[PDB]
Amino acid sequence: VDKHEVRVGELAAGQPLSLPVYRFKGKGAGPSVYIQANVHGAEVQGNAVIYQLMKLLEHYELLGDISLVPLANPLGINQKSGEFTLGRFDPITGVNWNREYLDHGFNIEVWYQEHSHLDDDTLITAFRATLVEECARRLNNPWGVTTGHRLAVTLQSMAHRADIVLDLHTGPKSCKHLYCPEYERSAAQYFSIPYTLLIPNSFGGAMDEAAFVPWWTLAEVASSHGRELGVRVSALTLELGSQERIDLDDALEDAEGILAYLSHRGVIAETVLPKPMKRYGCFLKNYRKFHAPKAGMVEYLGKVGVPMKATDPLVNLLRLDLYGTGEELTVLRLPEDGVPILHFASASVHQGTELYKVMTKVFEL
Amino acid sequence: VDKHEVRVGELAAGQPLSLPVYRFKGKGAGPSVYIQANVHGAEVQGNAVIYQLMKLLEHYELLGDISLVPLANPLGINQKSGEFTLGRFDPITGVNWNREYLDHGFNIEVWYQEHSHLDDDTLITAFRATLVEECARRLNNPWGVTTGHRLAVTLQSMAHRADIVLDLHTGPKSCKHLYCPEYERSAAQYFSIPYTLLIPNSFGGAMDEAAFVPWWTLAEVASSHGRELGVRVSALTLELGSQERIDLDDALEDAEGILAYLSHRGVIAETVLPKPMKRYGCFLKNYRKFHAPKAGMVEYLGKVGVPMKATDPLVNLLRLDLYGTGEELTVLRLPEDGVPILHFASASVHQGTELYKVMTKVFEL
Amino acid sequence: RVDKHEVRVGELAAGQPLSLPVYRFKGKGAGPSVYIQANVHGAEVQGNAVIYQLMKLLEHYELLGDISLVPLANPLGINQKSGEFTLGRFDPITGVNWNREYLDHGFNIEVWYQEHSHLDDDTLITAFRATLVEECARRLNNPWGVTTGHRLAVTLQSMAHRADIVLDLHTGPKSCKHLYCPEYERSAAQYFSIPYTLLIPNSFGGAMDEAAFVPWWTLAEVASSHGRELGVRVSALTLELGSQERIDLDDALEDAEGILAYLSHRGVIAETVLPKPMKRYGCFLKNYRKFHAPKAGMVEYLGKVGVPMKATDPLVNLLRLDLYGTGEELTVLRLPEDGVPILHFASASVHQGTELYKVMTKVFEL
Amino acid sequence: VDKHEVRVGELAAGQPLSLPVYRFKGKGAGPSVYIQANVHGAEVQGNAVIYQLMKLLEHYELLGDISLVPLANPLGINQKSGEFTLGRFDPITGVNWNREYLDHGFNIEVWYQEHSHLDDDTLITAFRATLVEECARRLNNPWGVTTGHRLAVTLQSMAHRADIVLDLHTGPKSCKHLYCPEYERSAAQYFSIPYTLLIPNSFGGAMDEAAFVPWWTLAEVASSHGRELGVRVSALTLELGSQERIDLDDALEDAEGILAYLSHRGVIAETVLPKPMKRYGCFLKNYRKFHAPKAGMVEYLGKVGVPMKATDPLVNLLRLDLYGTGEELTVLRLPEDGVPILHFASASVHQGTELYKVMTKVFEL
DSSP states (O other): OEEEEEEEEEOTTSOEEEEEEEEEOOOSSOOOEEEEEOSSTTOTHHHHHHHHHHHHHTTSOBSSOEEEEOSOOHHHHTOBSSSSBOOSBOTTTOOBGGGOOOOOOSOHHHHHHHHTTSOHHHHHHHHHHHHHHHHHHHHTOTTOOOHHHHHHHHHHHHHHTOSEEEEEEEESEEOEEEEEEGGGGGGGGTSSOSEEEEEOSOOOSSHHHHHHHHHHHHHHHHHHTTOOOOOOOEEEEEEEEESSOOOHHHHHHHHHHHHHHHHHTTSBSSOOOOOOOOOEEEEGGGEEEEEOSSOEEEEEOSOTTOOBOTTOEEEEEEOGGGTTTTOSEEEEEOSSSEEEEEEOSSSEEOTTOEEEEEEESOEEO | OEEEEEEEEEOTTSOEEEEEEEEEOOSSSOOOEEEEEOSSTTOTHHHHHHHHHHHHHTTSOBSSOEEEEOSOOHHHHTOBSSSSBOOSBOTTTOOBGGGOOOOOOSOHHHHHHHHTTSOHHHHHHHHHHHHHHHHHHHHOOTTOOOHHHHHHHHHHHHHHTSSEEEEEEEESEEOEEEEEEGGGGGGGGTSSOSEEEEEOSOOOSSHHHHHHHHHHHHHHHHHHTTOOOOOOOEEEEEEEEESSOOOHHHHHHHHHHHHHHHHHTTSBSSOOOOOOOOOEEEEGGGEEEEEOSSOEEEEEOSOTTOOBOTTSEEEEEEOGGGTTTTOSEEEEEOSSOBEEEEEOSSSEEOTTOEEEEEEOSOEEO | OEEEEEEEEEEOTTSOEEEEEEEEEOOSSSOOOEEEEEOSSTTOTHHHHHHHHHHHHHTTSOBSSOEEEESSOOHHHHTOEETTEEOOSBOTTTOOBGGGOOOOOOSOHHHHHHHHTTSOHHHHHHHHHHHHHHHHHHHHOOTTOOOHHHHHHHHHHHHHHTOSEEEEEEOOSEEOEEEEEEGGGGGGGGTSSOSEEEEEOSOOOSSHHHHHHHHHHHHHHHHHHTTOOOOOOOEEEEEEESOSSOOOHHHHHHHHHHHHHHHHHTTSBSSOOOOOOOOOEEEEGGGEEEEEOSSOEEEEEOSOTTOOBOTTSEEEEEEOGGGTTSGGGEEEEEOSSOBEEEEEOSSSEEOTTOEEEEEEOSOEEO | OEEEEEEEEEOTTSOEEEEEEEEEOOOSSOOOEEEEEOSSTTOTHHHHHHHHHHHHHTTSOBSSOEEEEOSOOHHHHTOBSSSSBOOSBOTTTOOBGGGOOOOOOSOHHHHHHHHTTSOHHHHHHHHHHHHHHHHHHHHOOTTOOOHHHHHHHHHHHHHHTOSEEEEEEEESEEOOEEEEEGGGGGGGGTSSOSEEEEEOSOOOSOHHHHHHHHHHHHHHHHHHTTOOOOOOOEEEEEEEEESSOOOHHHHHHHHHHHHHHHHHTTSBSSOOOOOOOOOEEEEGGGEEEEEOSSOEEEEEOSOTTOOBOTTSEEEEEEOGGGTTSGGGEEEEEOSSOBEEEEEOSSSEEOTTOEEEEEEOSOEEO
């Protein structure tokens, strides 16, 4: 396993901020893969998944290149506030690190017309080069870029080089879930993840969108001019359970599912079949946020990853300040049938604190 | 002066979160005004400006109603982290409190068509009622709304009721500046603020935009159908110097400038002239952010509100870890001529930390 | 039945007062008085659930002594968030632990004793209590003022000083149920439903229990040095009821049932409530050890809280993706001595020196 | 100037925590010196002081060794919360980095009796070796030590090796002041510092105390057996103005004061005279903390380092929530005549927030 380090920033006291990049060289015509974990500092299980995946890959026949970037945001990973990693956003500005990726601005209609005389492979190579160069340009600005933008664009440049991008995250108190763009709903069949969110061709600041939107858009533009190029990049986001947790056995299960997808895509020569299990989904627009309608102390009743019906108890809300009044213990209920995916990591909420995220209008994939 | 209290939230231990609303009734046909301060918790000087304005208003003849909401975000105001106020964003999620306002989704073209028969005043009354009603609809949701969204929508509902909205902020280490929509560039000459950013018809989550975007879009639609309605609301954001400070004399000067605008608008009967001083403008697109190109300890040389040249030293960057190498003390310079408006409030930066914001292509108003 | 009053403990910059709800059940008898508080550490919310369940139960018992309960005892800490966690343990401005702000009475107890020794036991005790209550008032009446945390602690303390029994309800981070019990009342552990007890000495270290018992224990010592037996006339125990950032009403019922056994034992309630049968272990406080990370990294916790282990047992796996391909990629850290891990760090990522576990060593059955 | 790095810790993502140690070798018999800065993360001016000192030291004739340790707490230096450095205490535990030093437990009376047959220099050498070894023993513990304790003891071990220890800090919003032990009141005359706190032989967790307490106790014990050994180490703490600030020219003034002390002690051969200026002192017991008696917004009126009377206004307390009542704006005053040294860095306080520290019963040195 070839390893190098990639510089992503620098701290006030002088210390460089760098990432370890592990590379497995493929011997064949299989697709290239880029995997990263822990952009969100508290979401550490992704590192254990990378560890297990690399241990497994050491016994497979790699047909395509694989690059793996654990510990992808040291500034967030190393940031504590109390006994909790404050790792989700820049502590100075509040900007979510996974909202700092680069939306390629250029006109794809024009880019396509200017390259439409090239054959598919040549055109694809040129498009990839244009994205990599756009990242370089962005970082070359004399006014500079934000701390998180430098990190994200640096990761993005590496991701753009691959045919397949897997971004490993975790939820707070959460079940395993997956984000797939609508064009590759089938990907969910190979991972070992029970709930999938199908997402549209829209850039919203995150790595997966940053990676797929240019290619999905190029595919549509090409087809609109009678050329069926196809979407040439896969980019998926795996939300592997809960944050602030390392569970090596569970990480192995996640890694086994990833291998099934890698086998399916021809990255590895061996046939690795998907885990037989039920897989459900919902379209992103039906993924709902449930906010505390009143403040108070919270006992979570809705178990993550378990379907619930409209009006079922989601939490008990306890109010010691209201003892004997009639409202010291109340039940907050789920508005619509759905599956609670994740809940707030703390037991005390203000009015409006996000208590849960719930997939509604869920279907079997 | 009538005092009222408006609830905006509730804390886990049981206390309600509420705001003081001071209302002066006008005796006449003057425009109505809504003024708030301290939505960003550290930006406390706005409270002193409200204090001084109310003290002054007691000696003027009010022709229009004025509502004043100091201490507009107690959750942010009361949030300390070390010896400073962590007041800019929700500490749980990182979302800027001034990015939680509501962009009205309804079709203004259709709305206009359905009300085009009304005269100006009734059409304005109808539109205003619609905006107020949409805020109410937003807060009534079984899935709830964020802590910051409840606060923002509550403030916005009050703001929508006024003809003039003044949002009082401060910068970090900053000179006095003003955000003014392009449709009322004339406003800038009445306030006592040397630098003004002229901003376009675009919603970006903030109060001023929330208040003016619907009316500006309405004006455009009306005009397209041959009706020159005009933009019937004014909404301006005053960035009154630096955060984490109360300066009552300085606040009086700010209040006097506000009074000049209110006099100009016929809110008060008396003639209060603008303070004589030079005033400059800049289109929003030319307001640039300068990020640290390297980490280190900063001596700030560019003074806020003082024009400078690209060749001038902006900061000295000290690196004790590089003593003896030639890199221990380096000078940073801005890529372009301009006027630094504000700079970072700390002397320690990581690579990418936003060091200054700078108005470029400045012109005299 | 229950009377509620509010007690002011501070004020916020924007104007809102900081206040506590104080619930009181009046006793109809000669039983001892009891003062119970919870959630002085903001993240330690289970104590509210314990107070809730206890009050629901108490409504059906016969009270011989007064019981005052103070849930939500620190709204400034309780309401303080940082990320998806309550930054509730210390003043966020200064770092000072809210449970290190209590008042150590400085007056000379030997001299106070000599000046009141002619009094009978009950009159001497009443006088001592009055002195403690007055000393708290004097502390808060200072033109230079006092810290935010000291004002809170001293307000709680003055209430606590009025009772015969003080129960401070806490939680650990990821923790089993444990109890702090002063050496002079080792028997108390036999009544609660708590498997592990730390026996603590006569020493003031800034906390409520110490603040409550040190003056009385010292007074008993002074009286005994003169051949007069007064006894330690106040009981002050700290219950660490599981993990923080959690409300578990069923588990809180169990805790409340144990507290009731102690109250029956002390004659606060008329009814017989016998202790839950279970093995109960203890160790002296000096044998309660802090295990710090020897190296930074990602941690998988192997030592389960409340489960005895040996030195040869794995405490955690330490995972280092930055060291992949070397022997340091994944290592096992082990405890240096046999003991019982009580609690561990609430996060999976540690720096060198981060406190990984607290472990009772030299444990014995009580 | 020789430079080496000293390991003090390690972060979660794997990065080492190290300090740059700059060493100037002495040639002769002059006392040795240990200088450190920025143990408290926000107190960055000490770095500028060290930078100036090192530039100056390259031209002086050194008779004793000098070690300088700027950037002495990278974990605290690099920690941000909003636009400020949360650098005073461990963000996990709240423990002040400058309360983590080691109080040597060993019986000095016994130690002295076991070495009383040794002459002064042999005894001094042995006592120093004992202190250094106790630090090593502390760090060699299978149960480990806290993050802050490892740092503090590492710094302390280096400090113990020197004859003169200078710990460079800053206050929040503060004038320049000095902590000087009662046994060397004469040292204060040399520094360029107007206000000095004379401190007793008491260990409170801080570097200076950690460095001097053993030697001061040893002097007491020696003297009690008819041997006037004297206190063989000098340990002073300079609070060099305000935090979150780099001012190079002002740092130069501080460095020159330091060099006057060093010249006075014979560390450098050249005569560097102290700056003429009035110098005052105060015994530590008379340094008082003034806390907010009520919450609110604060305008600081008491200027740091300027004597005041109990009848003078210290702050205006502004309460917008109490407008229209006598409590809308009130004046808080100093209970006793004194010199305000430092005040709170923010303008919004809760009841009990420490507003000022004030030296009372001040005398000219």
